[PDB]
């Protein structure tokens, strides 16, 4: 008999310092951590898209009922949850004619096809951000469905990177999503059925729009102070590897500064997924300065986590640039080792939070499982745990497990109970996907609002 320890669920802050374990609950009961005055929408799409968008924004002002109200919480309504106004009558609409799509659509070269479509949308946004005297908050690109699959070097990835030099928050919404009732695969039933998850859909879009407009729907408070949780993700470039980083830490006022610390730190080496001594020193130095300016003092340890193991030379580079009194922790979080724990009797999979301490330097942690409060698994079947191993440095295998589970509570791109992998490893994945999708920008923005 091997004994499984249980990791308590960390709490995410909300309004009035109140804490709840579910963002959908702490928002509904208490509201966002910081409120914005309102959101001024901006729509770049066809006349059909604008009507749908105006329909949907007006739809989510009022409470929304999904079939299974017991398990997944209902949506009280946008102004009811967040406190701000999101009006569909304040839309700075920029029409894109359907015929204009056709001429770009017929270009032979795929490179010219995707680039012209990206240049189509961003140019209207960029011009409307220089000529219009309207202070648009979030630019919503209701893209027609022909754009998605005829254009298929990614439309979505290209668009975000080219807007980085202008710092324009955008929220791409496929028309098949906002008008899901009106898109069927000739059977009469929707291509995707959102009927039972209407509140789930409305929750996710609203907090995304709320976040991109300068709002902070929630923040974390269950981390050890003085720690700079830095996450590294490597992306293949075609023999080039880019390694963006995302950092998360508490400021002096107990505020999480969840930002990036990014750049295409390139590895033209035959051995992949590692960093040269030159590149690795710059990466850790950047995060050290960012904490230095954000808090005044240096971190007393840096919690470096990644999905890849670290060799000696790059770790040595970290040691060389690391100041005195600061520890290093290298954590490798992978989702590959099959360790399926079927429950003895019953039909609901293993509960989230169970952890198997393999030894003093490794563990298996169940970030995905059965969540009691939501009463409906974010998964469907037996969930694979994530293998968490202390690759380098001296750290407590139980304290690391708590922190890794803690980092799974900062997903702003969705308002789910928790994410399977730590978000810092997921957001840095999104950043690397976005950045490299175009030419090398001298300085990327460090606000996730421009990537997610």
């Amino acid at each position: 008999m091997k004994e499984l320890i249980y990791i308590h669920e960390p709490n995410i802050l909300f309004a009035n310092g109140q804490k709840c374990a579910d963002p959908r609950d702490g928002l509904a009961l208490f509201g966002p951590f910081t409120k914005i005055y309102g959101i001024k929408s901006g729509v770049v799409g066809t006349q059909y898209g604008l009507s749908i968008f105006k329909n949907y924004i007006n739809h989510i002002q009022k409470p929304i009922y999904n079939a299974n109200n017991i398990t997944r919480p209902m949506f009280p309504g946008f102004e009811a949850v967040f406190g701000c106004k999101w009006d569909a009558d304040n839309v700075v609409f920029k029409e894109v004619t359907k015929e204009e799509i056709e001429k770009i659509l017929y270009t032979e070269s795929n490179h010219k096809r995707t680039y012209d479509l990206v240049s189509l949308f961003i140019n209207k946004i960029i011009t409307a951000n220089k000529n219009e005297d309207e202070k648009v908050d979030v630019w919503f690109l209701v893209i027609p469905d022909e754009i998605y699959q005829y254009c298929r070097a990614q439309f979505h990835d290209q668009l975000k990177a080219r807007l980085l030099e202008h710092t324009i928050p955008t929220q791409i919404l496929r028309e098949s999503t906002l008008a899901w009732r009106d898109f069927k695969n000739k059977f009469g039933a929707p291509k995707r059925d959102f009927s039972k998850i209407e509140g789930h859909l409305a929750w996710t879009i609203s907090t995304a729009a709320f976040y991109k407009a300068g709002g902070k729907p929630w923040k974390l408070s269950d981390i050890r102070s003085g720690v700079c949780y830095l996450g590294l993700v490597y992306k293949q470039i075609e023999p080039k590897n880019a390694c963006c980083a995302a950092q998360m830490f508490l400021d002096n006022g107990d505020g999480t500064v969840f930002k990036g610390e990014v750049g295409p730190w390139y590895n033209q080496e035959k051995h992949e997924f590692h960093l040269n001594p030159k590149e690795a020193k710059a990466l850790l130095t950047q995060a050290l300065n960012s904490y230095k300016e954000q808090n005044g003092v240096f971190p007393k340890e840096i919690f470096i986590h990644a999905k890849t193991k670290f060799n000696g030379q790059e770790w040595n580079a970290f040691q060389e640039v690391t100041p005195e009194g600061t520890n290093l922790v290298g954590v490798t979080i992978t989702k590959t080792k099959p360790l399926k724990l079927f429950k003895s009797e019953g039909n609901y999979p293993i509960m989230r939070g169970n952890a198997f301490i393999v030894n003093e330097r490794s563990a298996f942690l169940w970030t995905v499982g059965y969540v009691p409060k939501t009463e409906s698994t974010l998964s469907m079947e037996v969930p694979n745990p994530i293998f968490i191993e202390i690759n380098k440095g001296e750290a407590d295998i139980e304290q690391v497990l708590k922190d890794v589970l803690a980092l799974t509570k900062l997903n702003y791109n969705a308002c789910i109970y928790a994410d399977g992998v730590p978000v810092t490893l997921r957001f840095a994945d999104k950043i690397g996907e976005i950045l490299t999708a175009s030419t090398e920008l001298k300085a990327p923005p460090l606000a996730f609002k421009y990537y997610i």
Partner: protein, 419 residues
């Protein structure tokens, strides 16, 4: 009739808490009178504050704080609250909701010091959960203005900290720990007697030619028929190694580092499992990076074993419980047995189209549940049980690897309602 819940609080700061408290109670249907949210402008406020405490109030809620007890205008609402409490013969009338962190039941006025407070110092949602218990216990009547909102908000408050039971639960893994393994691991130098690049995979027993040594547990003169002049080999050139010493990570010999030995053992272990499968006659299936195994249609009795149909049918094909056992030694040597669903239109040949199988695999998966996957996997290995308590892996003439036919069991100290 008196069916209103009065709220007293400090004027400037308590508003935030009381506003949230007032709206939630109103949303639940509890009639509430707040001195800032329901006081008409230009009225004689004490005239209407006193009057409603005497006449309109059925409960009295005090937002207790370090200043709400030093505020002259609040104690006056307390002082009249005690008086109306006396005539109403209701001891459960004044409910001093404590919110301030620094106020701990030792600077409270004697009037409320005898009373039982409701704690909000740590969390407002739970503190409000305490109040709903207190109000429902006393049968305080509340209207149903919007029934859907009242029920939903009640549930949101009700299920705030619940679902973590201290009950023990047993989990069945896909790990199958090895029971037995050969005592000695041997390097055969059949090189002098080995043909150039002699395929080592064709051997009856698993043997890896590490350098010029055929690393295997198999006895020296075993491959007599397969490998010619086997008997002519001298047992002196065979290098004996204690297997348990390797598994303990102590055999750091200069000839071979310990780390390489386990990987060979796993290489031997996976090969031996594959070799056993041919003996068991299970139909195999190549994968992207692995090797599948299953039972052909009609091979198994009614295509079912241990009251579990290891072989079934979906759409126009036959779903087959696929497996891909993989070996692991760190830290406890375990042979992981995975779970898969292969598909065969006739029950024999598998759909060659990878697209059709993968689409089929998902369609079958959305049917099986946690319990179903457990039943399918454990029935599969039970069919593969050589012994009634294990199944062996022949790696030599007299060398065997018994592995527990039952999966490794994990125990946890937290469970849930599992509705």
């Amino acid at each position: 009739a008196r069916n209103k819940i009065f709220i007293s609080h400090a004027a400037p700061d308590d508003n935030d808490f009381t506003k949230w408290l007032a709206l939630k109670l109103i949303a639940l249907g509890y009639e509430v009178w707040c001195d800032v949210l329901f006081l008409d402008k230009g009225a004689d406020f004490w005239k209407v504050i006193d009057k409603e405490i005497r006449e309109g109030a059925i409960k009295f809620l005090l937002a207790t704080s370090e200043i709400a007890i030093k505020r002259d205008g609040v104690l006056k609402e307390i002082a009249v609250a005690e008086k109306v409490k006396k005539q109403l013969k209701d001891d459960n009338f004044i409910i001093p909701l404590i919110i301030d962190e620094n106020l701990s039941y030792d600077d409270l006025p004697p009037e409320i010091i005898r009373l039982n407070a409701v704690d909000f110092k740590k969390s407002w949602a739970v503190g409000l959960q305490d109040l709903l218990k207190a109000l429902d216990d006393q049968k305080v009547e509340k209207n149903s203005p919007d029934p859907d909102k009242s029920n939903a908000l009640y549930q949101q408050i009700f299920l705030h900290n619940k679902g973590i039971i201290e009950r023990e639960e047993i989990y069945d893994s896909n790990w199958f720990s090895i029971l037995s393994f050969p005592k000695e691991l041997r390097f055969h130098d059949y090189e002098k007697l080995m043909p150039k690049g002699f395929d080592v995979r064709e051997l009856t027993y698993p043997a890896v030619r590490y350098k010029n040594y055929l690393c295997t547990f198999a006895w020296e003169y075993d491959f007599m028929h397969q490998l010619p002049k086997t008997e002519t080999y001298n047992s002196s050139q065979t290098i004996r190694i204690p297997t348990e010493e390797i598994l303990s990570g102590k055999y750091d010999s200069p000839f071979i580092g310990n780390f390489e030995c386990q990987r060979l053992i796993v290489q031997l272990l996976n090969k031996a499992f594959e070799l056993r499968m041919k003996e068991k006659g299970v139909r195999e299936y190549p994968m992207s990076n692995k090797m599948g195994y299953w039972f052909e249609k009609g091979k198994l009795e009614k295509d079912k074993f241990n009251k579990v149909l290891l072989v079934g049918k979906q759409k126009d094909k036959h779903w087959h419980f696929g497996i891909s056992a993989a070996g692991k030694l760190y830290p406890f040597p375990v042979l992981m047995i995975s779970s898969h669903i292969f598909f065969t239109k006739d029950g024999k040949e598998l759909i060659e189209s990878k697209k059709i199988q993968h689409a089929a695999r998902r369609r079958q998966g959305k049917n099986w549940w946690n319990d179903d996957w457990r039943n399918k996997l454990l029935a599969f290995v039970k069919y593969l049980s050589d012994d009634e308590n294990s199944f062996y892996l022949e790696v030599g003439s007299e060398e065997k690897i018994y592995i527990s036919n039952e999966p490794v069991q994990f125990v946890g100290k937290v469970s849930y309602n599992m509705p």
